[PDB]
């Protein structure tokens, strides 16, 4: 019928066929995809971006490096990598809330945010956050007052971004470990604000 | 390419399927889902058969309805498979034989791409620029919402990269250009029909011109 989907074998069968077609020709090194799977699951992680935020919150000199040469700051920690070679950190302020998207696909600072979540790659987010970020954030559980400008960064080239969120009050004197725990993946993407227990 | 993948600003979608900090489950939600990225890297770094930009473009070349009903990671399975057939590494027949059934691919390209522009300008932070009012049928890393619109430079990258409109087609004339963080007021892009403040697009030098 009109506008019907094309016939397709099960996606798992098609993905593994792609693998076997290449692997059987000797074109895929031993353990090559298993190795990437492990990198993607274990190494690329928003815990790294949380470490960077907590360091910036407690070290003015690192904060300044992260905001002026994010690549350099990240390299100090050894966290450069694929889709994370040219890093720019964008600073939230009392009058500015930053949010990151890839409207054309899914582009994300993989090594310090982790691979993007399903929702970030959704057509709903890709279409809507550029045009109505306040309503999207609100729907997602984050209210941004009218006194704050919202700035959406569309990741359309090689720059890979992370948000440096505002440090919330009630965290004075906390350790880096304590601060890291309240910086989540969504805070690094920009759709959430770090929360402290009461 | 003015394909359905250029979604920013489309109206009619519903709620984003997420609440902040909700559980997003494991990195991969099926045992095959690591294969499209891993095999993309195999193609780029081990085979040298294509560029990352060619992967973005072959996904843009999915038949439009096919794109719209296909989950993200499956689009990259289809894309990488398509490039392997186009580059002569695999055949569709062996893919369908192995898969036990149909394996439709992206559509052939209808553009040969274009070279890195011969004439561009090095812009400075604070300068006003216009996005070139150009229509590119092949790959381009300019979302249509900003075509022809004016914004201000907040950053010029200190690194340079091959022009997507060339390297996305495997051309030898992609050269290298820096990109620019261009800040647009929301009202510049969507008039009164936005609730935002500003949008920053990371635009190759060859997409820009002085705003006068
Ligand atoms: Fe993307
Ligand atoms: Mg339209």
Short mmCIF file of C-alpha atoms and ligand atoms in Angstrom, two decimals:
data_model
loop_
_atom_site.label_atom_id
_atom_site.label_comp_id
_atom_site.label_asym_id
_atom_site.label_seq_id
_atom_site.Cartn_x
_atom_site.Cartn_y
_atom_site.Cartn_z
CA UNK A 1 0.00 0.00 0.00
CA UNK A 2 0.69 3.68 -0.28
CA UNK A 3 3.38 4.91 2.15
CA UNK A 4 3.88 1.34 3.45
CA UNK A 5 7.17 0.19 4.92
CA UNK A 6 9.48 -1.87 2.71
CA UNK A 7 9.85 -5.57 3.43
CA UNK A 8 12.83 -6.15 5.71
CA UNK A 9 14.45 -9.10 7.43
CA UNK A 10 14.66 -8.71 11.27
CA UNK A 11 17.11 -5.94 12.11
CA UNK A 12 19.26 -8.29 14.24
CA UNK A 13 19.60 -10.61 11.25
CA UNK A 14 20.60 -7.70 9.01
CA UNK A 15 23.13 -6.23 11.50
CA UNK A 16 24.80 -9.62 12.08
CA UNK A 17 24.79 -10.28 8.33
CA UNK A 18 26.71 -7.03 7.84
CA UNK A 19 29.20 -8.17 10.46
CA UNK A 20 29.60 -11.67 9.01
CA UNK A 21 29.91 -10.42 5.43
CA UNK A 22 32.86 -8.20 6.44
CA UNK A 23 34.42 -10.52 9.01
CA UNK A 24 34.40 -13.46 6.59
CA UNK A 25 36.52 -11.44 4.17
CA UNK A 26 39.14 -10.79 6.86
CA UNK A 27 38.28 -7.10 6.97
CA UNK A 28 37.47 -6.94 10.70
CA UNK A 29 40.43 -7.46 13.05
CA UNK A 30 40.19 -9.98 15.85
CA UNK A 31 38.02 -8.69 18.69
CA UNK A 32 37.60 -5.33 16.92
CA UNK A 33 33.87 -4.81 17.47
CA UNK A 34 33.98 -6.36 20.97
CA UNK A 35 36.68 -3.84 21.83
CA UNK A 36 34.54 -0.92 20.64
CA UNK A 37 31.54 -2.30 22.57
CA UNK A 38 33.65 -2.21 25.72
CA UNK A 39 34.91 1.31 25.06
CA UNK A 40 31.35 2.50 24.44
CA UNK A 41 30.00 0.84 27.58
CA UNK A 42 32.80 1.32 30.03
CA UNK A 43 35.09 4.17 29.07
CA UNK A 44 32.85 6.77 27.51
CA UNK A 45 30.87 8.03 30.48
CA UNK A 46 29.10 11.08 31.93
CA UNK A 47 31.03 10.33 35.13
CA UNK A 48 34.03 11.94 33.39
CA UNK A 49 32.12 15.14 32.60
CA UNK A 50 30.85 15.15 36.22
CA UNK A 51 34.52 14.98 37.40
CA UNK A 52 35.34 17.93 35.18
CA UNK A 53 32.41 20.00 36.48
CA UNK A 54 33.27 19.25 40.14
CA UNK A 55 36.90 20.24 39.51
CA UNK A 56 35.80 23.48 37.83
CA UNK A 57 33.43 24.23 40.73
CA UNK A 58 36.28 24.02 43.24
CA UNK A 59 39.28 25.27 41.28
CA UNK A 60 38.94 28.72 39.67
CA UNK A 61 42.04 28.21 37.54
CA UNK A 62 40.75 24.97 36.08
CA UNK A 63 37.29 26.53 35.58
CA UNK A 64 38.92 29.24 33.52
CA UNK A 65 40.92 26.72 31.45
CA UNK A 66 37.84 24.59 30.83
CA UNK A 67 35.88 27.63 29.61
CA UNK A 68 38.71 28.97 27.39
CA UNK A 69 40.34 25.79 26.07
CA UNK A 70 38.10 22.87 26.89
CA UNK A 71 40.27 20.45 24.86
CA UNK A 72 43.26 21.31 27.04
CA UNK A 73 41.33 20.88 30.28
CA UNK A 74 39.92 17.53 29.18
CA UNK A 75 43.33 16.34 27.98
CA UNK A 76 44.73 16.90 31.49
CA UNK A 77 42.41 14.07 32.62
CA UNK A 78 43.15 11.91 29.59
CA UNK A 79 39.58 12.02 28.35
CA UNK A 80 39.97 13.15 24.71
CA UNK A 81 38.64 10.59 22.21
CA UNK A 82 36.38 9.91 19.23
CA UNK A 83 33.69 12.59 19.02
CA UNK A 84 35.57 14.40 21.71
CA UNK A 85 38.72 15.90 20.17
CA UNK A 86 37.66 19.59 20.03
CA UNK A 87 35.79 20.37 23.30
CA UNK A 88 33.99 23.54 24.18
CA UNK A 89 32.39 23.94 27.62
CA UNK A 90 29.55 26.49 27.87
CA UNK A 91 28.87 28.21 31.17
CA UNK A 92 25.41 28.56 32.72
CA UNK A 93 24.96 31.83 34.65
CA UNK A 94 22.10 33.38 36.67
CA UNK A 95 20.77 34.79 33.38
CA UNK A 96 21.72 32.07 30.87
CA UNK A 97 20.81 28.36 30.52
CA UNK A 98 22.65 26.37 27.83
CA UNK A 99 21.32 23.25 26.09
CA UNK A 100 22.94 20.93 23.54
CA UNK A 101 21.41 19.07 20.60
CA UNK A 102 22.34 17.57 17.26
CA UNK A 103 19.29 18.47 15.15
CA UNK A 104 20.73 16.72 12.08
CA UNK A 105 21.62 13.36 13.76
CA UNK A 106 23.03 12.72 17.29
CA UNK A 107 26.42 14.43 17.59
CA UNK A 108 27.54 14.28 21.22
CA UNK A 109 30.78 14.63 23.24
CA UNK A 110 31.00 10.85 23.60
CA UNK A 111 34.00 10.40 25.84
CA UNK A 112 32.85 12.77 28.59
CA UNK A 113 29.04 12.56 28.27
CA UNK A 114 28.75 8.95 27.13
CA UNK A 115 26.98 7.92 23.93
CA UNK A 116 23.76 9.87 23.51
CA UNK A 117 20.57 8.47 25.07
CA UNK A 118 17.67 7.36 22.91
CA UNK A 119 15.65 10.45 23.79
CA UNK A 120 18.36 12.85 22.57
CA UNK A 121 18.32 11.14 19.19
CA UNK A 122 14.50 11.30 19.00
CA UNK A 123 12.78 13.24 16.31
CA UNK A 124 10.84 15.03 19.05
CA UNK A 125 14.00 16.45 20.64
CA UNK A 126 15.79 17.17 17.32
CA UNK A 127 12.79 19.05 15.96
CA UNK A 128 11.59 20.86 19.06
CA UNK A 129 14.43 21.94 21.34
CA UNK A 130 15.88 24.42 18.81
CA UNK A 131 12.51 26.20 18.47
CA UNK A 132 10.85 25.82 21.88
CA UNK A 133 13.55 24.90 24.39
CA UNK A 134 11.70 26.40 27.33
CA UNK A 135 8.64 24.23 26.80
CA UNK A 136 10.72 21.14 26.07
CA UNK A 137 12.75 21.58 29.26
CA UNK A 138 9.58 22.19 31.24
CA UNK A 139 7.98 19.05 29.85
CA UNK A 140 11.17 17.18 30.81
CA UNK A 141 10.87 18.41 34.43
CA UNK A 142 13.11 21.55 34.34
CA UNK A 143 11.56 24.99 34.80
CA UNK A 144 13.56 27.90 33.46
CA UNK A 145 12.33 31.28 34.64
CA UNK A 146 11.57 33.95 32.04
CA UNK A 147 14.51 35.96 33.43
CA UNK A 148 16.93 33.42 32.01
CA UNK A 149 17.92 33.40 28.35
CA UNK A 150 18.00 29.85 26.96
CA UNK A 151 20.80 29.22 24.44
CA UNK A 152 20.66 26.08 22.32
CA UNK A 153 23.91 24.77 20.81
CA UNK A 154 23.28 22.76 17.62
CA UNK A 155 26.22 20.38 17.17
CA UNK A 156 26.57 20.71 13.40
CA UNK A 157 30.31 20.37 12.88
CA UNK A 158 33.29 19.05 14.87
CA UNK A 159 32.94 21.11 18.08
CA UNK A 160 31.69 18.82 20.85
CA UNK A 161 30.06 20.58 23.79
CA UNK A 162 29.47 20.11 27.48
CA UNK A 163 27.42 22.36 29.77
CA UNK A 164 29.05 23.70 32.91
CA UNK A 165 25.93 24.07 35.13
CA UNK A 166 25.59 26.49 38.02
CA UNK A 167 26.75 25.12 41.33
CA UNK A 168 23.62 25.02 43.53
CA UNK A 169 23.63 26.60 46.95
CA UNK A 170 23.76 24.21 49.87
CA UNK A 171 26.92 22.57 48.55
CA UNK A 172 29.47 24.86 50.15
CA UNK A 173 32.53 23.00 51.34
CA UNK A 174 31.53 19.74 49.65
CA UNK A 175 34.27 17.47 48.35
CA UNK A 176 34.85 16.82 44.64
CA UNK A 177 33.32 13.32 45.10
CA UNK A 178 30.22 14.78 46.69
CA UNK A 179 29.83 17.38 43.97
CA UNK A 180 30.41 14.83 41.20
CA UNK A 181 27.46 12.76 42.40
CA UNK A 182 24.95 15.52 41.70
CA UNK A 183 26.23 16.33 38.18
CA UNK A 184 24.31 13.87 35.94
CA UNK A 185 24.32 13.11 32.22
CA UNK A 186 21.30 15.36 31.77
CA UNK A 187 23.07 18.23 33.51
CA UNK A 188 25.98 17.91 31.07
CA UNK A 189 23.56 17.91 28.11
CA UNK A 190 21.83 20.93 29.63
CA UNK A 191 18.26 19.70 30.13
CA UNK A 192 18.63 19.28 33.93
CA UNK A 193 19.98 21.45 36.75
CA UNK A 194 22.05 19.72 39.48
CA UNK A 195 19.85 18.99 42.53
CA UNK A 196 20.89 18.84 46.17
CA UNK A 197 18.99 16.85 48.77
CA UNK A 198 16.88 19.63 50.29
CA UNK B 1 20.31 18.13 1.12
CA UNK B 2 16.82 19.32 2.11
CA UNK B 3 15.82 15.89 3.37
CA UNK B 4 13.49 14.89 6.15
CA UNK B 5 16.53 14.46 8.46
CA UNK B 6 16.69 18.29 8.72
CA UNK B 7 14.15 18.30 11.51
CA UNK B 8 14.93 21.42 13.56
CA UNK B 9 11.87 23.64 13.58
CA UNK B 10 9.40 21.04 12.29
CA UNK B 11 6.09 21.35 14.14
CA UNK B 12 3.69 18.60 15.21
CA UNK B 13 5.90 16.27 17.22
CA UNK B 14 4.84 15.33 20.72
CA UNK B 15 6.66 15.04 24.05
CA UNK B 16 10.31 14.11 24.18
CA UNK B 17 10.30 10.56 25.64
CA UNK B 18 12.25 11.41 28.77
CA UNK B 19 11.98 12.97 32.23
CA UNK B 20 15.21 14.46 33.61
CA UNK B 21 17.51 11.89 35.19
CA UNK B 22 15.13 9.04 34.39
CA UNK B 23 16.69 5.60 33.83
CA UNK B 24 17.89 5.29 30.23
CA UNK B 25 18.81 1.63 30.56
CA UNK B 26 22.09 0.16 29.34
CA UNK B 27 24.18 1.80 26.60
CA UNK B 28 22.96 -0.87 24.15
CA UNK B 29 19.41 -2.22 24.39
CA UNK B 30 19.95 -5.07 21.94
CA UNK B 31 22.91 -7.35 21.37
CA UNK B 32 23.46 -6.02 17.83
CA UNK B 33 23.38 -2.30 18.58
CA UNK B 34 27.14 -1.82 18.98
CA UNK B 35 27.72 -3.10 15.46
CA UNK B 36 26.81 0.00 13.38
CA UNK B 37 29.28 2.33 15.12
CA UNK B 38 31.97 -0.35 15.42
CA UNK B 39 31.69 -1.22 11.74
CA UNK B 40 31.65 2.45 10.83
CA UNK B 41 35.02 2.78 12.55
CA UNK B 42 36.18 -0.35 10.81
CA UNK B 43 35.25 1.24 7.48
CA UNK B 44 36.88 4.58 8.27
CA UNK B 45 40.02 3.58 10.18
CA UNK B 46 40.82 0.01 9.12
CA UNK B 47 39.44 -0.28 5.58
CA UNK B 48 39.82 3.41 4.63
CA UNK B 49 36.69 2.81 2.55
CA UNK B 50 34.77 5.97 3.49
CA UNK B 51 34.71 9.04 5.76
CA UNK B 52 32.44 9.75 8.75
CA UNK B 53 30.86 12.46 6.59
CA UNK B 54 29.92 9.82 4.00
CA UNK B 55 28.11 7.93 6.79
CA UNK B 56 26.06 11.02 7.73
CA UNK B 57 25.17 11.52 4.06
CA UNK B 58 24.24 7.91 3.27
CA UNK B 59 21.81 8.08 6.28
CA UNK B 60 20.41 11.31 4.82
CA UNK B 61 19.93 9.30 1.59
CA UNK B 62 17.55 6.83 3.15
CA UNK B 63 14.20 6.91 1.37
CA UNK B 64 12.28 9.56 3.41
CA UNK B 65 9.49 7.31 4.75
CA UNK B 66 12.10 4.61 5.49
CA UNK B 67 14.09 7.16 7.52
CA UNK B 68 11.04 8.18 9.51
CA UNK B 69 10.04 4.68 10.65
CA UNK B 70 13.56 3.34 11.34
CA UNK B 71 15.12 3.38 14.82
CA UNK B 72 18.42 5.32 15.12
CA UNK B 73 20.91 2.46 15.34
CA UNK B 74 19.20 0.62 12.51
CA UNK B 75 19.63 3.64 10.25
CA UNK B 76 23.39 3.26 10.70
CA UNK B 77 23.24 -0.48 9.96
CA UNK B 78 21.50 0.40 6.72
CA UNK B 79 23.88 3.26 6.02
CA UNK B 80 27.10 1.37 6.60
CA UNK B 81 25.80 -1.58 4.59
CA UNK B 82 24.91 0.80 1.74
CA UNK B 83 28.39 2.32 1.68
CA UNK B 84 29.97 -1.15 1.71
CA UNK B 85 27.95 -2.03 -1.40
CA UNK B 86 28.57 1.33 -3.08
CA UNK B 87 32.36 1.13 -2.47
CA UNK B 88 32.36 -2.41 -3.97
CA UNK B 89 33.37 -4.18 -0.74
CA UNK B 90 30.14 -6.13 -0.37
CA UNK B 91 27.20 -7.04 -2.53
CA UNK B 92 23.55 -6.65 -1.74
CA UNK B 93 23.11 -10.29 -2.71
CA UNK B 94 25.48 -11.56 -0.10
CA UNK B 95 23.91 -9.31 2.54
CA UNK B 96 20.41 -10.62 1.77
CA UNK B 97 21.69 -14.20 1.64
CA UNK B 98 23.31 -13.85 5.05
CA UNK B 99 20.33 -11.94 6.49
CA UNK B 100 17.83 -14.50 5.18
CA UNK B 101 15.63 -11.84 3.65
CA UNK B 102 15.33 -8.33 2.28
CA UNK B 103 17.93 -5.69 3.12
CA UNK B 104 16.86 -2.51 1.33
CA UNK B 105 19.53 0.20 1.31
CA UNK B 106 19.70 3.97 1.08
CA UNK B 107 18.98 5.60 -2.29
CA UNK B 108 21.72 6.50 -4.72
CA UNK B 109 23.14 9.96 -4.42
CA UNK B 110 21.73 12.58 -6.78
CA UNK B 111 24.62 14.96 -6.32
CA UNK B 112 28.37 14.61 -6.88
CA UNK B 113 28.98 17.06 -4.04
CA UNK B 114 30.91 20.31 -4.29
CA UNK B 115 34.44 21.48 -3.54
CA UNK B 116 35.58 23.57 -0.59
CA UNK B 117 34.72 27.14 -1.69
CA UNK B 118 37.62 28.95 -3.37
CA UNK B 119 36.63 32.32 -1.93
CA UNK B 120 35.92 32.62 1.79
CA UNK B 121 36.60 35.08 4.59
CA UNK B 122 38.36 34.67 7.92
CA UNK B 123 35.84 36.16 10.42
CA UNK B 124 36.52 37.50 13.94
CA UNK B 125 34.63 37.13 17.19
CA UNK B 126 31.88 39.78 17.30
CA UNK B 127 31.51 40.14 13.55
CA UNK B 128 28.07 39.94 11.96
CA UNK B 129 27.70 37.24 9.30
CA UNK B 130 24.99 35.89 7.01
CA UNK B 131 24.56 32.25 6.18
CA UNK B 132 24.96 31.99 2.38
CA UNK B 133 21.58 31.72 0.65
CA UNK B 134 22.56 28.59 -1.21
CA UNK B 135 20.84 25.30 -1.93
CA UNK B 136 23.03 22.19 -1.87
CA UNK B 137 21.46 18.90 -3.05
CA UNK B 138 24.21 16.72 -1.62
CA UNK B 139 25.61 16.72 1.89
CA UNK B 140 25.82 19.98 3.84
CA UNK B 141 26.19 20.70 7.60
CA UNK B 142 23.91 23.70 7.55
CA UNK B 143 20.34 23.08 8.91
CA UNK B 144 17.84 24.95 6.77
CA UNK B 145 16.52 27.08 9.66
CA UNK B 146 19.64 29.25 9.46
CA UNK B 147 19.96 29.58 5.65
CA UNK B 148 20.09 33.28 4.74
CA UNK B 149 19.90 34.40 8.39
CA UNK B 150 22.24 36.78 10.23
CA UNK B 151 24.10 36.13 13.44
CA UNK B 152 27.28 37.06 15.31
CA UNK B 153 30.50 35.09 15.68
CA UNK B 154 31.21 33.89 19.21
CA UNK B 155 34.11 31.55 18.31
CA UNK B 156 36.45 30.67 15.43
CA UNK B 157 37.89 27.21 15.82
CA UNK B 158 41.64 26.87 16.25
CA UNK B 159 41.57 23.67 14.15
CA UNK B 160 40.45 23.10 10.57
CA UNK B 161 38.58 20.24 8.92
CA UNK B 162 37.59 19.01 5.44
CA UNK B 163 34.50 20.67 3.98
CA UNK B 164 31.59 18.26 4.52
CA UNK B 165 30.01 18.97 1.17
CA UNK B 166 33.09 17.48 -0.45
CA UNK B 167 34.35 14.80 1.98
CA UNK B 168 30.75 13.64 2.48
CA UNK B 169 30.88 12.50 -1.16
CA UNK B 170 34.40 11.07 -0.99
CA UNK B 171 35.86 13.92 -3.11
CA UNK B 172 39.56 14.85 -3.18
CA UNK B 173 38.89 18.61 -3.00
CA UNK B 174 37.53 19.07 0.53
CA UNK B 175 40.54 21.17 1.61
CA UNK B 176 40.23 22.44 5.14
CA UNK B 177 38.36 25.19 6.89
CA UNK B 178 37.71 26.35 10.43
CA UNK B 179 34.19 26.52 11.75
CA UNK B 180 32.44 29.31 13.54
CA UNK B 181 30.04 29.33 16.45
CA UNK B 182 27.36 31.64 15.02
CA UNK B 183 24.82 33.00 17.49
CA UNK B 184 21.34 33.76 16.16
CA UNK B 185 18.53 35.41 18.08
CA UNK B 186 15.56 33.05 18.27
CA UNK B 187 13.36 35.66 16.58
CA UNK B 188 15.80 35.78 13.65
CA UNK B 189 15.13 32.09 12.97
CA UNK B 190 11.46 31.65 13.94
CA UNK B 191 10.00 35.18 14.28
CA UNK B 192 7.50 35.24 17.18
CA UNK B 193 6.95 31.46 17.03
CA UNK B 194 9.64 30.40 19.49
CA UNK B 195 10.07 30.46 23.29
CA UNK B 196 13.87 30.42 23.20
CA UNK B 197 16.53 33.11 23.44
CA UNK B 198 19.38 32.28 21.11
CA UNK B 199 20.65 29.39 19.00
CA UNK B 200 24.36 28.80 18.20
CA UNK B 201 25.11 26.86 15.03
CA UNK B 202 28.64 25.58 14.30
CA UNK B 203 29.10 26.58 10.69
CA UNK B 204 31.93 25.93 8.25
CA UNK B 205 33.61 29.04 6.92
CA UNK B 206 32.39 28.30 3.39
CA UNK B 207 28.77 28.61 4.51
CA UNK B 208 29.20 32.23 5.58
CA UNK B 209 29.55 35.72 4.16
CA UNK B 210 29.88 39.16 5.72
CA UNK B 211 26.59 40.69 6.72
CA UNK B 212 27.49 43.39 4.18
FE1 LIG C 1 24.67 13.99 15.23
MG1 LIG C 2 9.21 22.76 6.61
#
